[PDB]
Structures are given as structure tokens and as C-alpha cells.
Amino acid sequence: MSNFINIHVLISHSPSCLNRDDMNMQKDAIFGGKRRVRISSQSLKRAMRKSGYYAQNIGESSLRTIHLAQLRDVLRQKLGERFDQKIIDKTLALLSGKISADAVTPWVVGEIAWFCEQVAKAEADNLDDKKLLKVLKEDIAAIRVNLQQGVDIALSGRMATSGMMTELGKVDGAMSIAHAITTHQVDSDIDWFTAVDDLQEQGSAHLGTQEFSSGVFYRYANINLAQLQENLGGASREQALEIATHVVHMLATEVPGAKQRTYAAFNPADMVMVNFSDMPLSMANAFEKAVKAKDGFLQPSIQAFNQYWDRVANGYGLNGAAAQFSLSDVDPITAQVKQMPTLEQLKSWVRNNGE
Amino acid sequence: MRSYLILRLAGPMQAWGQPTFEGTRPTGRFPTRSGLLGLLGACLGIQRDDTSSLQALSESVQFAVRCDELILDDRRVSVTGLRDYHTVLGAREDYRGLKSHETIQTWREYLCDASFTVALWLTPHATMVISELEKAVLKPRYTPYLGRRSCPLTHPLFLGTCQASDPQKALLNYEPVGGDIYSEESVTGHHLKFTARDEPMITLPRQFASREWYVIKG
Amino acid sequence: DEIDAMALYRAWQQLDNGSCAQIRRVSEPDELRDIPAFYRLVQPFGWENPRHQQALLRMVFCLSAGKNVIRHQDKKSEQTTGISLGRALANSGRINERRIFQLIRADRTADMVQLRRLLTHAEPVLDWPLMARMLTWWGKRERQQLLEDFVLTTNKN
Amino acid sequence: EIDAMALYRAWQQLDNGSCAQIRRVSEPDELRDIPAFYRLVQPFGWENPRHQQALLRMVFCLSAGKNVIRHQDKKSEQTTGISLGRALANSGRINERRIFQLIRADRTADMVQLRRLLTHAEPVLDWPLMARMLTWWGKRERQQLLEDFVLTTNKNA
Amino acid sequence: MNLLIDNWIPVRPRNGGKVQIINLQSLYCSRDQWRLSLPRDDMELAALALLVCIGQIIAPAKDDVEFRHRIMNPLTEDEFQQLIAPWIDMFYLNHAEHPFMQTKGVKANDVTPMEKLLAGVSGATNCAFVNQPGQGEALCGGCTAIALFNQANQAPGFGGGFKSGLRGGTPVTTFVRGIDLRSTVLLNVLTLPRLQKQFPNESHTENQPTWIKPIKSNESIPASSIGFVRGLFWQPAHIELCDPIGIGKCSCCGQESNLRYTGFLKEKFTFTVNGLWPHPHSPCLVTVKKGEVEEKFLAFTTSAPSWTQISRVVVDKIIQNENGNRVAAVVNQFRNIAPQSPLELIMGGYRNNQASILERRHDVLMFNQGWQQYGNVINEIVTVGLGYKTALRKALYTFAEGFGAGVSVHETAERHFYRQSELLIPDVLANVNFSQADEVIADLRDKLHQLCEMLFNQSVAPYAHHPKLISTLALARATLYKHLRELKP
């Protein structure tokens, strides 16, 4: 019954450039005094949210539609202190245009409440409904659209432009994604390219440059189960865990799109670990002391992670179910961490609350 | 004489804000009062409209922040900074409706290699008690982060609990000792102050009022 | 910039009996500089600023008459200041006019000694921050104003 | 005035025999009974009677050992360096009552006790400032020593 | 509402707590010690400036004697009432024919929101995304007057045909700071002789406010012909506040008010002020190119730290032949009046791209006593800093281009440099003893030297594994140690 799901991933990409700045230079950061290459949280999370897998398993979930119909009673009990039921059901009739739920997502309550306020203010001055609809047709279209994307909004949070209006409408995602930094110091490379002119191949060419690098990145993300449930209208823990499994999959497979058509770093992760916890922690300090290559960076990184876990986990209060999948057979993490031969078994273990 | 709660705020990246109404989002060098209140808020699952709970929190708790320097393999690593060219496409053009900009741009500053030890205590007019705060920090309800949500913690938020007369005295029991301390309470030998605009005006959303830290140099 | 009087007052009230005891043994304001407990007492109140030292030395010295010899009382909302030292001394009914006479005519150091004796003897009730300002300047004008307030009070009351 | 760092550097480079011979005194005036002393302090104006008392004190403290008093230059930021009292307090080896009984100790009792404190605490300090303090050494320089001690101890805690 | 009579000034006790709203008489005639309190520093600067102007027209001292005297002692209420008497009918926010800083009878198709007076809340395409909404819903009388003043002074103009203020757009304002708001306001008021030395008031020069004697459309105004009252309260735009709504909460202050404002009207309007009005609140850069001279008021143009502008704000430079610099009149005055006093200087300003605020700045600089006379020292500290900065920038620029690595790192590196410099130079300026300062300055140069080395190596580090780069890296390092050696006296 722990509240937080921690997801750790070590993924190695080949020479590429998955994220750069306004000066077309790879993003970076400094960790432990040494420069790591960075893939911003934003870059990664978009990579996820705009992905096909996300569409299919989040954008098309059965919990995606919120039926205003079933929310009548509860909405009335929650808004009865501020509004008379006349304007409440007027309102719900406008919005919907046409099983009783015992609980409701806060952003729904908040936005609804805004619409009620507008309806009341409209009635107090004999404004008639046709022109009321005219005035706020836009807002209605919007909230209608958000009412059929309840899981997307619950996992990632409101879209950048959403028509949300109130303060409860500021909807945070339940998954937080951390920026990804390399486990090691990077020797950046610099491509010097030209552009042949087929009609005058001669002459002296004008060279351009592009920075690029390969590296072993540590992705971290966590999921707040309680908030996921609360923002799905009181869903069950099992349903939250389903959505969570989709986040594990994505964080292990999706890669930002940048420069991929010319550098093609389409790499799956070589280690994924999931870990239940009361307090979400990043294990990034496994690499505070930058990793030094020894037959590559992947193995020393995995080893550094396993060993850091062995060293601190118990003391840091990471007492909760824990599993690890990896394609690299390095000296294993401790035995309280149950090994998964395949990603899918890891997923289903998450699906089963870690048993 | 007084009982303190001791927290550690540590992660690869942090961000603690300064006055801005622009697309560049600045950081200072240590946690802001507003931000610490926000951290505690997140632990005590307080929704953003809950002005009562927010006010209770703000009036109950006070902080002292120590800036811990990092040491790797017997060498000092100074806190440095970072600017992220942060882009948003499909961003709202207006608060009402659904028209949106192709691309907008923001610049966001972070702290690198930063770590803090915070001591908090209760006020005489406290609506709360420390047991609550401890329970919360150990089992938070909303996701806790260091400034921004992209900034995980690399060490449990709870460090310890103790009892002393100063904040200074309290913090002495917890390594690393030697960093500067910014306290909401005065410490007798020390006279310097540091002005900020941390204090959240709870009655007026997303607006902050000036306050002053007391500085205890190390 | 200006010295907090009320803070110092309350500080003196809540001082541990041993420290108070250590301070109560001076027989002359400058002797306060021989005493650790003193520096610990006045450190928060700007002792380290040379401008405020003489002033502080007097304040503490008078307070050093006893832990509650100087009873502070707030002024009434109506009037602009509270009870002056002279007035309180007169109100006590224990202070003879000639005492004030010889007080305002005394040399430096001696005056403060005498004053402290008068305070122990009277246990005055007065506006302490007012007295504190007075001690802050303590010149001809102030001594004179002391005796005047005494005389006029004793006259009506 | 008397050159301080010169006297210090001379003391650091004195020959160990003279050095041990000087250390052996038990009272500043006994230095007058020693040749090595005169040769040491002559380049620094011992021949001028105004400077004599002072020198006697300075050397006496230095006589604690060739490397008991550790000079450290003031940081360019700070207007003055580390004074004696701060140094002693910083040592963590000195008890407040030693300092208290030091400043209340009579000519002569005084220097002996100070030297004992110096050997015990092996303080790091701005030497020329100490030298000045020793040049004058009157009620207020003593009281200032106690101030720095007490206030530093309170600051640091 | 009337600025001289009614309560508008947002303050909290210097030491104290709960905010209250006083009137000018309570400020000028009370030994109560006040400090401004709004949720924004730019609006506090707007406020302070407004108050200073006000005081500058109602009560300039007749000599330094009186100046010191009134700083040390508040006025009597009667003195005050006598002083403000002839001005009252000029400071009415809502008035029949002369509204404060507004223009009666404005032709506008639609109502402009109140937010457009709040510099920064909107104006750029990323504002709706990063900013909290509703801040311009309904404003106090005070928040409004103050915003109005800020818009006609330090903020950028609305755009198209909305002329900027008299000092140009986005000037830097520098004030002397005191113990309370009272003494502050008084401390930045030019005494009568200095005032008339700077502005000789003729029958030739118009000295009436803009909202009483309007600027004529497309008039060509000789700058010299503007009187200190007309200019200090200059309003270059045609604005007119809509009728106020009822009781409620300043969506800016958080305070409640009897009347609150929800929109205003504006229309385009153009004129031309030939010359430079000698505003007493801002520094003024002078560059003489090709015999011709140009004076221009100081403005934040770059993102570089505030210390890089300190020389332009405290140090005079009057050399005919060359570029020089004039500090703000109030600072020169204070420099004369208080030649034994330290300085606590308030500076602030915006950095903009048309109507877009790109950055806001507000600093309270400190200076030890020697600042009036030892400006050369200050100047040297500042140019030391920039000197080392350019050392680094030139070196890494070399690394990028040649006489090339192919990557530019010098900008990042400058950001690092500047961020550490913020911990170094302002401290120096605040605590150095100008009379004898060579030691501190030399220490600074060593710290900055180390810094440039560290950042140079850090910056080229990731690329130095390829021999072809180590080649040009050697040359770059060479130019670095060049430039770095030329910074040692």
C-alpha cells in the first residue's frame, strides 16, 4: 500500500543529439563538478505524451470519458453551499447538452463551479440563454474536450492550452519526470559537414558544424498513485497501477525525436527498475562521482546503480516491493530486489502491486 | 528549550525563485520561504485553493536554511548554475478559449550540485504540532520536489528531530557543519540580514511580500 | 539606529538569577565592563556599536538596582508620553527633594550611583523607554528637567 | 613607535640557546638579568626609555615559546585582525574565569597569568595588534580583552 | 481621489507589521517611521518617485541648513497645509476638467484592460503562460495613480503611436535612501538654489502640468521650454480612466478600497521634444562622436549584473574631448550636502523589447563613506571586472573561430563568470576603504584571474580529446594568458 512508484532507467544511446538549445548545442548540466549531457524533462515527457503508445493506452482508455450525468448528486452536495440547485442543473444541462458516482475529480468540480458562477451572474441580469451560450461557446467547447481526455489529464496534466479557468484547473500530472543526465563525463564530438552543389561541384566549399555525442543516460520518473486515483474520479488502486505500467513501458522505450533522421539513436533501455515507496527518491547519486569507462560506460553504470542501491536503499527508507529488468548480466543487485527476465513480466508485477 | 524538525533538500538540480513576470525564471542560491512552505504544503496534501490550510501552515512554521557544500574525494565542489532554453509549443495565447501560439520560449535557471539542511520550528500561535509535520515529510501526499517538478530528491526529506535554543545550535548536530545559515530567528552574535521577497500573500494568489533573513555566516 | 529599550527591559526581567547577581555587584557604571554577564546581556542590543555604549552602560546600571525595582507602565493612549522619572520619584513619597538637588549637581559617575540608590529606594513606576532616552542624552537639560518635574509633581500631588 | 613584526621575526630566528634561556624567566623584569634579551630588543629601540616597559611585556609573552603565539595577517577585507581575546576564546582551551581573574590581577600578577594562558592556548592572532595592546595595557585594554573573549564565545556557540 | 489630501500611500512600519494606508500629511508631519509596501518592487519605485516629485514641487528647502533641519524634524501640520494649498486642484484622480495624468475626452473604439498599465504582466507572447491571471481586474486609487506614473516614466510605451517619456524609454532611476520613507523622499529633493540653477523659470517656459495645459498635436517643443513641474509630471500619452466600480479588493495590492478601476481609454498621439530635458532622477551618458555630442539617459541594455553599471551611477566624468558621464542630480546634491556620509542608493529599471518587458531590475547598492571623492577607485573596480570578463570572452571566442572548434562556448562561460562575479564585486564595493584600497583590489584581481582560468579549461574540456582541436586550443590559451597578463599593474 505504498503511495509512490519509482521508475529508474539506464539507457545508452549511440552517437546522436537528442536535445539542444537556442545555439544548437547539446543540452548539458553539471553533476558532481563534472559536465554531463542532459535530455530535458520536457523533451522526454513530450516524447512520451505525443507517442503512439500513449495514444493507444492512455488517449484511448476506457476511463477517458467523464459522464456529467453520473456526477449530478455528488456535484450538488459539493456545490450546494455556494449555489442553488436550479443553476447547478441548468449548468450541467448546458455543458452536457442532454450508476451514480460517489466521488468527483477536483478539476471537474472547480471548472463546473466557474460555469455555475457565470450562469448565476447571467440570470441575475435577465440575460437570455441564447446569448449566454453565444458568450461562452468557446469555454464550453473546451471543457467538453477535456471531459473526454480524463486519463491524459490525470497522468500528464492539462494541455498547454486547455481552457481551464479556475485554480483547481491547474492540473499537475501525477507522473513527474526528472531531467536525464549522463552517468559519466562526456567527450563531445563535432561533425564538420558540407553541401555539394551538383551544378558547380568545384569551388571552395562552405563547411558547417554540428555537435554530437553518445552516452549512458539515467532517466528517473515517479508516479503518485493517490493523486492518479483522485484525478480519475476515485478510481481503484488496480487501475492506477495499470496506468503506471504504461508509464514504465514508455520510460523504458520512448526516445525524443530530435535529429533522429540523421543520427538515428533508436535504442531501448538496458536496465529498468521499479520500486514502491512512501517517499520518492532519485538514485542519481549513484553517479555523483562520475562513472569511469571500463569496457564501456553501460556496465560500470549498471554496476554503480546496483551497488548504490545495496549501499543506501535500506537507510534511505526504500522499504517496499522492488524489481529489476536488465539485459546486462553484471554482478546482481541484492536479493530483496526480485529479478525480471523480461520487461513485460516487470510490467505485470507492477500491475499486481508488487507480488 | 525548543523542539526542531530537520530536513534535507538535496538533488542534482534545484530551483528557488525570485521576482519575475517574464519568461526567464530565475533562481537564488538557497530555498525561499515561499518554496519551503510549498514543499511542506505538498507533503500535507494541500490543494491550491485551500486558503485556510495554507494560512495555518504559514503562521505555524518558521525555517532556517543551511547551505551545505559538496565534497567529492576530498575536494570541494562549488554550487554552480544552469540555464535551460525551455520551449513550449501550443501554448495558450489567452486565459479564455483555445487559441494558441506556435512556439513561445522561456529561460529557466537551476542550481547544480546544491544541497541544504533545513531546520523548522513552531510559532507560539501554532495551529499545528511537529508530529504532524514529521509524519507528513515521511509519508507525503503530493509529490515532493526541489523547486520544480522536474527536480527529484536524492535523499529522504526527513533528516532528524531534536531540541535546542538556537536554530544554529540545532543544526550543529547534523553534518555537514560549516555552511552559512539563513534564519527567520535572530541569533545573538550575528547582525547581518538579507532581504528577499519570499513571503507568500495567501489572500492574494501568486504574489509575494518582502521579508528579511538573518544571516549566520560560517 | 536607536536603542531598543523595551527589549532590554524584558531581557533584564527574564535574566537568570546568577547573572543578575553578577551584574548587581557593580558599584560604578564602568565596572560593568569587568563583567561577562553584562556583555552577554547587551550584545543583542548594539553594544558592539561604540555609539551606544555609554548609553547602554547607564541603562543597565539603573536596571541593576534590582530585578523589579523599575516597574514599567505603558502610557495612556491619550497623552503623548508616559510618566517621567522625576514624576515617579516624587510619586513614590519616599524621595526627598534635596536628594534630587544633590543629584543634578553631582559629577560624572557619582550621579549615576546616586540615581541608582534613589531607584532602589523608590521603586518607581514609569515609562521606561522614556527614562532610557533620558539616560541616552543625560546632560544639563535633562537633569534640570528631572528636578522640574519633581518639583511640580510634589507641588500638585 | 615599536616595530612589531620585526621583533616577532627576530624572535622566530633567535638561537635556541638564547631562546630557552629567555623562556626561563618568571617575571618580566627578570629579563633585565639576561644578555640575549638586550641583544634581541636593542634594534627595536630599547635604548629609548619610553619604549622599555612595553618591550618587557612583549618579549615576556613571546617567551612562552618560539612558536606558541602564531601570527596570522589580517584579511584585506577586515580592518583589524584577530585580537587576543578572540584567539583565546577560539582556542576552546580557556575558561572564562581565567580571563576574568586575569583582568582583575594587578600589575605584574597580570603578565604571568597571561603567559600561562598563552602557553595553554597556543593562539593564532594578529601579533602587532597584541603588541599595541601590550604597549598601552591599561584598564580599558584589559576590559577590551574580556569583551572580545566573552562576545566571541557567545557568537560562536 | 486627491494625492495631497486623501489616503493612498501603501506603507508598513519600518520595523512593524500590518500594512496600512496613509495620507501625505501623515508622512510629512510624523516621526512615525514608514516603509513602502506593495507586492512589486517596480511599483514601489514608481511610488517613491511620485512622492519625490510631489515633494519637489511643494517643498524645496531654501538652503542646506533648512534641508538638514527638515530631515531631522518633521513639519507641523499647518506648515504642511500651507505648503500644499496652491497645488491641491492639480492632483485629483477623478476631476471634471483636469484629471491627474489623464486627458479629458479620449476617442477610443474599445476599452483597454487595466493590466496594460501593469508593466510585465502582459505584453509578450509567453505571458499568458507563465503569469497568474486577474491582476488587472480592479485597482485601488493608489495602485492606479502609481501605475499611471510608472507608465509615463520608467515603463516602455504601449507601442505604435504611444510616445515614451521625457527621459526616453526605460530609464534607470537612482534615488538616495534614508531611514524611513519620509527622510528618503526629502533626501531626493533639490534645494531651491540647486533647483533654479538647474531650471531657470521664465515667462518663456511653460510650467503647467500636461493635464492642465495640453501638449498640442505634432507640436515641436524646445526641451528647454519645459518647466520642472511640467516635466517631472510629464505625460506623453492620451489616457483616461473609466468610471470606477464599487467597494472591493485591489487585485494588485490585496487591500480593499472604496473605489476601484477596471479599464481606461487610450488613443495615439505624437509630438516631438527637441533636446534633452535635464531630469534630476537619472544618470546621463555623454558621447562626443565626430565633434558632435550626444547625451542619452542610462538604460539597461544587457543582462549583465548591476555592478557593471555602478560606474555610470555614482561616478562623474566631465572631460571635454571624450565620452563622459553625469550622475543624477539628486546624487550630486547629496554628495555635496553630506560629504562625510555613506551611501545607500536605490537603482532600478526595465529592459525591454518594444512593449515587452524582457527583464526587471531593482538593486539597493551600498557604499562606504569615501564614495563622494574617490570615484576613481569605484571606476577601477568595475573596469577590472569587465576587464577579466573580456579576457575570457576573447579567449573562448578564439577557441570557437580562429584568426576553429566549430562550437561556441563563450556565452555560457560568460554566464558562469558573471554569476560568480555577483558574489565577488558588490561585496568589495560595499566594504572597501576607498582611502586605501589597493590591497582589496589586488585580491579581487587574483580571484578573477583564477576564475577565468578555471572557466576556460572547464569550457574547452569536453572537446580537447581530438588533436585537431588541441592545436587551436593552444593558441586560444595563449591569447587568454596574454589578456590576463595585461591586467596586472
Curated annotation (Swiss-Prot), chain A:
Any one Gene Ontology molecular-function term assigned to this protein's record: RNA binding
GO biological process, one term: CRISPR-cas system
Induction of synthesis: Repressed by H-NS, activated by LeuO. Activated by the BaeSR two-component regulatory system, possibly due to envelope stress. Part of the casABCDE-ygbT-ygbF operon.
Keyword field: Antiviral defense, RNA-binding
GO cellular component, one term: protein-containing complex
Reported phenotype of the disruption mutant: Loss of resistance to bacteriophage lambda infection, loss of plasmid silencing. Increased levels of 57 nucleotide crRNA and also 2 and 3 spacer-repeat units.
Subunit structure: Part of the Cascade ribonucleoprotein complex, with stoichiometry CasA(1),CasB(2),CasC(6),CasD(1),CasE(1)-crRNA(1). The 6 CasC subunits make a helical stack forming a groove in which the crRNA lies. Interacts directly with all of the Cas subunits. Stable subcomplexes of CasBCDE-crRNA and CasCDE-crRNA also form, both of which are able to bind target dsDNA, and at least CasCDE is able to form R-loops. CasCDE and CasCE complexes have endonuclease activity. Interacts with YgbT (Cas1). Binding of target ssRNA or dsDNA causes a conformational change in the Cascade complex.
Name of this protein: CRISPR system Cascade subunit CasC
Organism phylogeny: Bacteria, Pseudomonadati, Pseudomonadota, Gammaproteobacteria, Enterobacterales
Gene name of the record: casC
UniProtKB/Swiss-Prot annotation, chain B:
Keyword Metal-binding attached: no
Any one of the GO BP annotations: maintenance of CRISPR repeat elements
Gene Ontology molecular function, alphabetical: DNA/RNA hybrid binding; RNA binding
Any one of the GO CC terms: protein-containing complex
Swiss-Prot/TrEMBL induction comment: Repressed by H-NS, activated by LeuO. Activated by the BaeSR two-component regulatory system, possibly due to envelope stress. Part of the casABCDE-ygbT-ygbF operon.
InterPro entries found in the cross-reference section: CRISPR-assoc_prot_Cas5 (IPR021124), CRISPR-assoc_prot_Cas5_N (IPR013422), CRISPR-assoc_prot_CasD (IPR010147)
Disruption phenotype annotation: Loss of resistance to bacteriophage lambda infection, loss of plasmid silencing. Decreased levels of crRNA.
Keyword set, alphabetical order: Antiviral defense
NCBIfam families, A to Z: casD_Cas5e, CRISPR_cas5
Function: CRISPR (clustered regularly interspaced short palindromic repeat), is an adaptive immune system that provides protection against mobile genetic elements (viruses, transposable elements and conjugative plasmids). CRISPR clusters contain sequences complementary to antecedent mobile elements and target invading nucleic acids. CRISPR clusters are transcribed and processed into CRISPR RNA (crRNA).
Record family assignment: Belongs to the CRISPR-associated protein Cas5 family. Subtype I-E/Ecoli subfamily.
Name of the protein: CRISPR system Cascade subunit CasD
Species classification: Bacteria, Pseudomonadati, Pseudomonadota, Gammaproteobacteria, Enterobacterales
Swiss-Prot record, chain D:
One GO-annotated biological process of the protein: defense response to virus
NCBIfam families: casB_cse2
Gene Ontology cellular component annotations, sorted alphabetically: protein-containing complex
Described function: CRISPR (clustered regularly interspaced short palindromic repeat), is an adaptive immune system that provides protection against mobile genetic elements (viruses, transposable elements and conjugative plasmids). CRISPR clusters contain sequences complementary to antecedent mobile elements and target invading nucleic acids. CRISPR clusters are transcribed and processed into CRISPR RNA (crRNA).
Deletion consequences: Loss of resistance to bacteriophage lambda infection, loss of plasmid silencing. Increased levels of 57 nucleotide crRNA and also 2 and 3 spacer-repeat units.
A Pfam family: CRISPR_Cse2
Keyword set includes rRNA processing: no
Designated name of the protein: CRISPR system Cascade subunit CasB
Subunit structure: Homodimer. Part of the Cascade ribonucleoprotein complex, with stoichiometry CasA(1),CasB(2), CasC(6),CasD(1),CasE(1)-crRNA(1). The CasB homodimer forms a cleft that cradles the 3' end of the crRNA. Interacts directly with crRNA, CasA, CasC and CasE. Stable subcomplexes of CasBCDE-crRNA and CasCDE-crRNA also form, both of which are able to bind target dsDNA. Binding of target ssRNA or dsDNA causes a conformational change in the Cascade complex.
Signal sequence range: none
From Swiss-Prot, chain E:
Gene disruption phenotype: Loss of resistance to bacteriophage lambda infection, loss of plasmid silencing.
UniProt induction comment: Repressed by H-NS, activated by LeuO. Activated by the BaeSR two-component regulatory system, possibly due to envelope stress. Part of the casABCDE-ygbT-ygbF operon.
GO CC entries: protein-containing complex
Keyword entries, A-Z: Antiviral defense, DNA-binding, RNA-binding
Family: Belongs to the CRISPR associated protein CasA/Cse1 family. Type I-E/Ecoli subfamily.
Protein name: CRISPR system Cascade subunit CasA
Source species of the chain: Escherichia coli (strain K12)
